[PDB]
Amino acid sequence: GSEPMFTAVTNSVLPPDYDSNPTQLNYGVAVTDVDHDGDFEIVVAGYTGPNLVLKYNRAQNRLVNIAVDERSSPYYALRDRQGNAIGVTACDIDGDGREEIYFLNTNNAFSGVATYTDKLFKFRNNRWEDILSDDVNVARGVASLFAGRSVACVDRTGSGRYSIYIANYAYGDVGPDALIEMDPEASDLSRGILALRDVAAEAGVSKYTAGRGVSVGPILSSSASDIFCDNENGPNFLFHNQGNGTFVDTAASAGVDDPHQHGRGVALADFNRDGKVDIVYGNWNGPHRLYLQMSAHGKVRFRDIASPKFSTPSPVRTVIAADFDNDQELEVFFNNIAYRSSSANRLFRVIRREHGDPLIEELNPGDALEPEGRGTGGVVTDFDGDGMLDLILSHGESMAQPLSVFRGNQGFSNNWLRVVPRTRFGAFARGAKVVLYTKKSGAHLRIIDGGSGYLCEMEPVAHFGLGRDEASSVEVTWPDGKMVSRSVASEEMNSVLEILYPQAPLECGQGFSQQDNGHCMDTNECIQFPFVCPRDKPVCVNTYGSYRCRT
Numbered sequence: 001g002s003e004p005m006f007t008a009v010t011n012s013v014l015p016p017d018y019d020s021n022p023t024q025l026n027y028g029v030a031v032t033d034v035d036h037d038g039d040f041e042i043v044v045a046g047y048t049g050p051n052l053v054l055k056y057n058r059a060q061n062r063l064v065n066i067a068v069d070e071r072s073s074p075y076y077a078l079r080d081r082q083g084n085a086i087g088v089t090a091c092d093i094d095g096d097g098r099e100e101i102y103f104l105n106t107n108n109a110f111s112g113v114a115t116y117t118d119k120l121f122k123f124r125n126n127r128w129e130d131i132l133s134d135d136v137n138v139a140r141g142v143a144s145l146f147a148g149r150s151v152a153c154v155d156r157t158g159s160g161r162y163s164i165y166i167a168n169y170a171y172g173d174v175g176p177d178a179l180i181e182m183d184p185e186a187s188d189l190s191r192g193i194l195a196l197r198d199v200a201a202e203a204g205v206s207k208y209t210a211g212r213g214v215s216v217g218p219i220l221s222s223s224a225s226d227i228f229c230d231n232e233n234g235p236n237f238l239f240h241n242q243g244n245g246t247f248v249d250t251a252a253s254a255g256v257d258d259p260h261q262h263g264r265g266v267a268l269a270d271f272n273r274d275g276k277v278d279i280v281y282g283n284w285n286g287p288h289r290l291y292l293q294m295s296a297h298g299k300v301r302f303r304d305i306a307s308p309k310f311s312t313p314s315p316v317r318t319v320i321a322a323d324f325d326n327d328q329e330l331e332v333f334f335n336n337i338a339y340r341s342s343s344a345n346r347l348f349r350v351i352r353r354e355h356g357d358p359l360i361e362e363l364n365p366g367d368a369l370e371p372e373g374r375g376t377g378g379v380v381t382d383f384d385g386d387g388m389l390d391l392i393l394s395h396g397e398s399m400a401q402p403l404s405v406f407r408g409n410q411g412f413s414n415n416w417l418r419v420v421p422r423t424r425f426g427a428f429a430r431g432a433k434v435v436l437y438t439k440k441s442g443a444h445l446r447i448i449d450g451g452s453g454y455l456c457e458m459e460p461v462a463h464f465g466l467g468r469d470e471a472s473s474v475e476v477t478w479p480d481g482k483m484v485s486r487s488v489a490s491e492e493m494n495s496v497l498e499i500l501y502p503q504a505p506l507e508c509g510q511g512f513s514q515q516d517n518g519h520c521m522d523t524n525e526c527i528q529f530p531f532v533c534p535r536d537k538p539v540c541v542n543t544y545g546s547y548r549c550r551t
Ligand SMILES: *[C@@H]1O[C@H](CO[C@@H]2O[C@@H](C)[C@@H](O)[C@@H](O)[C@@H]2O)[C@@H](O[C@@H]2O[C@H](CO)[C@@H](O)[C@H](O)[C@H]2NC(C)=O)[C@H](O)[C@H]1NC(C)=O
Pocket: 242, 243, 244, 246, 248
């Protein structure tokens, strides 16, 4: 409630300067591995100015920009100073195990027609090169001149090669959303011929909307990647993956169309830890939503549980859900833009309860309050590898301000585990679901972020806080449905586990058991008895991960 969660470390780790943290207009931020060396770099969309690629130097304890102003540098093209970048994400589009980097540029346009193309950078011929406008693609209808906002990776058919969802901002009947991916039939990767196509129309997502936020993962799907678009001046879309690379909108039916509000930052999470994916998002000067997935009438239906404080209107941009203090409960961070007046950032803990809905608790964001911050973007990542998530905030639009960097103040003695699933080709498995079964605390769910938070993309890591507890096993579900269950050894606690795509006896913890298919599932205590309920509360009710006894 009262103790400050964050300390600013900007001045020691990323001081305002010309080269690495300029006073400029920045927008989205994405975390990926740019130099294939295992560590993650932080890619910043420069709206007026170069894009930044920040790499942690342990010797100096600094984030240093490696996209230096040097034409001979392999990173030089990434600067794209002429591009007015807003959205960014990174995804392996060609299946080489390395991520490409997409910048949505919005030069001279709020909406409709823009004057400079988006960029999709790939490392080849020993340097980063734009492939959207190269010989192969320039006439293939994949580089267009539209305003837009967020982008996100989508493993559309479970192939392990990503499509990139492009949330364009239409003006009338100009500027539909796009879904860009590799065209295998026109590609020859042995010769570096990477042919792209837009499949938005055939996939069912070619819509004319005021695009804002996007999130991707198994929301209604058990394993396949659905797409949630929180738009403005109209309904949100909840694109249910049909299993054949196509999507059908289900938002109105599911109760998340929210047609009279204007979405910004968005994240997918399981707040009540019932294994069903929930949706949190900010509404621009509107009632922020925390939608728990429920199953009313055998049909799926989301229910808002936002408290009055949580839903208090603000000029929200970035929304992130993460366990900043490793205490097992997710926090939600709101990066507000102080464009007309002071507008403090907000932090809430969402506390799973034994009975009923989670409890929403306002926290003190400490140095991350930033009442004068023009917040435009942000990410979480553990860039220094100490097991505590770090927070980076970008600022811009209406006032040039440097990036800010924060470390957490709380939960140092709590346990943690970080899980990194890989695709069948060795890339970050964006869109994968990771479930951690704890010894006594039930099951925690993460989705690896392919794009979230409005304009951003978080590190490709399922970061679990374990509090005082320990892990029994992990379970990874890839978008294609492959599921791997693995015990976590004692010595693997408080570390990063890599989980490879599949080319010890299983521990499922309390409330769960290994089924005939080899995977952990809920134990039904009500039938697995010596009878569990006492005389005075004799009716047993089975729950996911537990049970309750009532009268
Ligand atoms: C892609 O699949 C959709 C959905 O197919 C239905 O749901 C799937 C999960 C599976 O159960 C299928 O057998 C179902 O048909 C197709 O849309 C359906 O198409 C049929 C045939 O025209 C139609 O009668 C259904 O009403 C459609 N259902 C929905 C929900 O739209 C779609 O045609 C498939 N497209 C391609 C190109 O394969």
